[PDB]
């Protein structure tokens, strides 16, 4: 039942969940009662089980359910028993770029946004590797400012990652990949919502920069260090005896 609920709640990755666990139960039951249905490794035995249980209740969905040789076999058997940017004009899918975005373990909402961007504005293109590259980079720089604000060892590792995920030794093209999308995507309300959420504004806060730029000297350029820093740095030399 644990494994049943596991594989059944593996579909997302009201009446649905209930009726589907009941379905898989009595389905597996019917399939194992008689002596007719054998040599079926339990390795895989809760999948077109789940697909036909989708087919049964009320509404069914061909996509995102089967997601192979024996998949067809067992189906019939049960059903009877009952570089990257020089490349010109490439093509992509939903899950291709879900992969290239989920490699950073970023959320799926940002990915859906880049997907919407694409399927509306993937029309007039030369190469979508550039656009989606720049997109997910300017997702990373905006959401990952904290860890980077304290760890400048990150910005080399990250750019190195996407330099070789798309197979180049030259990188200034990637720099352009970022600034051009930033020129493009600059002013949409959803981009706006993300900037108020994760608070980069060029990577710097609002309540600081406005005094940086309106015309002030109270502007806190933190050359000096904060108090808790020293409060914890002192422990390193406390035990200096050893």
């Amino acid at each position: 039942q644990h494994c049943v609920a596991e594989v059944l709640r593996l579909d997302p990755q009201s009446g649905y969940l209930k009726k589907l666990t009941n379905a898989t139960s009595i389905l597996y039951n019917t399939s194992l009662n008689k002596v007719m249905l054998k040599q079926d490794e339990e390795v895989a035995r809760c999948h077109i089980c789940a697909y036909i249980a989708s087919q049964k209740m009320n509404e069914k969905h061909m996509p995102d359910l089967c997601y192979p040789k024996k998949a067809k076999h067992l189906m019939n058997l049960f059903r009877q028993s009952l570089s990257l940017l020089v490349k010109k004009y490439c093509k992509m899918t939903t899950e291709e770029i879900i992969r290239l975005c989920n490699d950073f373990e970023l959320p799926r909402e940002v990915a859906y946004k880049i997907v919407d961007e694409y399927n509306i504005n993937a029309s007039r293109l030369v190469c979508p590797w550039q656009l989606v590259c720049g997109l997910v980079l300017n997702c990373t720089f905006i959401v990952f400012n904290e860890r980077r604000r304290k760890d400048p060892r990150i910005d080399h590792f990250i750019v190195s990652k996407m330099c070789s995920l798309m197979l180049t030794s030259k990188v200034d093209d990637v720099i352009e990949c970022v600034k051009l999308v930033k020129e493009l995507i600059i002013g949409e309300k959803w981009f706006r919502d993300l900037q108020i959420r994760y608070d980069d504004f060029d990577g710097i806060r609002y309540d600081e920069i406005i005094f940086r730029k309106l015309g002030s000297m109270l502007q806190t350029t933190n050359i000096l260090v904060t108090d808790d820093q020293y409060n914890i740095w002192k422990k390193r030399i406390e035990m200096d005896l050893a």
């Binding site: 002596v35 007719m36 249905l37 054998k38 040599q39 058997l77 009877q80 028993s81």
Partner: protein
Amino acid sequence: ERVFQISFFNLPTVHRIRDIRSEKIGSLLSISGTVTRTSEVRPELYKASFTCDMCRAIVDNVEQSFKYTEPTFCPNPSCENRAFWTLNVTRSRFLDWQKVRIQENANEIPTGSMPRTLDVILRGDSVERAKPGDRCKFTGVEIVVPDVTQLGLPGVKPSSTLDTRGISKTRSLGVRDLTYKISFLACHVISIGSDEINELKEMVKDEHIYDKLVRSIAPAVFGHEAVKKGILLQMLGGVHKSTVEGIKLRGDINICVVGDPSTSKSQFLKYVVGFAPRSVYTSGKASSAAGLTAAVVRDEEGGDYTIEAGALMLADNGICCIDEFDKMDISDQVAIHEAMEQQTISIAKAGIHATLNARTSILAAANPVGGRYNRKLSLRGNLNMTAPIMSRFDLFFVILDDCNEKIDTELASHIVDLHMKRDEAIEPPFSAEQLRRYIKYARTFKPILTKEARSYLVEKYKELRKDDAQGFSRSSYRITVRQLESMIRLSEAIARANCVDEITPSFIAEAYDLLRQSIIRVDV
């Protein structure tokens, strides 16, 4: 919804195992022999499904006798390799099985001979009609089976091989070696080896038929009435149930005798083993307890072990007549003691444990130290066997001779008359035939006590122990309470011998005088 069995009984001919050659193959042929073992019920492959290795297409048929391995034909033949197959268990039919090991009988045997043996196998509902340690008359057909035990043997050895001639361009020879044993099967088997009501109604009405039954049980032998009486009550068993705790009794009784050689002790053995339903004569010496009791297999022929049919395990509701008592080993008397103490046994080897049950009633044979029984010493210094084994015995006997010419002459007359072929010297009241049925009536009569009787039993034991009062004279083995329970089981046996329910003091007075006579005096 239909499977069947068949059998043909009352064939005219018998063939011993040696009387079977290679022309009786596929032939019904009736044999009789003996058993030493059974084995484990394991239900058998009658029918059994298979299925395609590439679809659910089932085949509900079976290659059945041997060749139990591979069908060919598929309903939808379109396959890359239809040659091999899958299987299934449930869409199947099964039927029981059983194995025994079959054995020669003594009364048909040659010289320089072992009881040559071999295996037989059962089938179907006729099973449960096997039995260990009994003669039986089988009937079936000369089934055979492969073997490789017969390797290392001389001359040339057949071998099978498919042909590669007339077809070509298609161990690669696929060679199998073939060499077999000749087992047997059985279609049916029987356990070899009314106005009787009026017969026995007439015999019972007498009074001295006690004496008749007494004297009729060894006309082959001369005198020694005590032997006759004791053996006649030995088969008779005592009620092992008369308790409340569930701690129990060795309901039956036990015996032995002493006597110098040149005596007719062994005549009695050969009699009773020549009469007894359940019995055995054995060595006394040339035996391990692994022979008396059961040493068993350790997982042979693949399948599980099976308790061996013990020799001393035998004598259920009977006897193990054993001669040559004195020359027994250390461990065998030990095992015997374990056998007698309770009516139960415990066994182990290779970690396996056992537990059995029996109520064996031994009669056996004493041989004194030098043979000469010094009449003025006591029993123990001459017997040479430790106390507990010397104990548990309700009885001891002694048979020793002396010069009496009047009677010695008629004894020699009897002996030499016995060298007249099948003479009428043994004219009894009657024969073994009615005796065996009389026993099967009488073994289960179950007698009862009374207050007068037991009240007299008490006072008679008082006088008995009062013979140990000035014991040590008419005394070679002294008194205890074993003697009284012995006497009580003897009253039980003897009322059963009478085939009447209520026992009186007069009948036990025979036991009174008996155990008074069972013992030996000595000098001042």
